[PDB]
């Protein structure tokens, strides 16, 4: 598990939203 392959989502939609 990585949060640098999820923050990378966790900053994606996290951007979008």
Curated annotation (Swiss-Prot):
Keywords: Competence, Pheromone, Secreted. It comes from the Bacteria. It is found in: Secreted. One of its GO terms (molecular function) is pheromone activity. One of its GO terms (biological process) is establishment of competence for transformation. GO terms for cellular component: extracellular region. Acts as a pheromone, induces cells to develop competence for genetic transformation. Belongs to the ComC family. This is Competence-stimulating peptide type 2. It comes from Streptococcus pneumoniae serotype 4 (strain ATCC BAA-334 / TIGR4). The lineage of its organism: Bacteria, Bacillati, Bacillota, Bacilli, Lactobacillales. The chain holds residues 25 to 41 of 41 of the full protein.
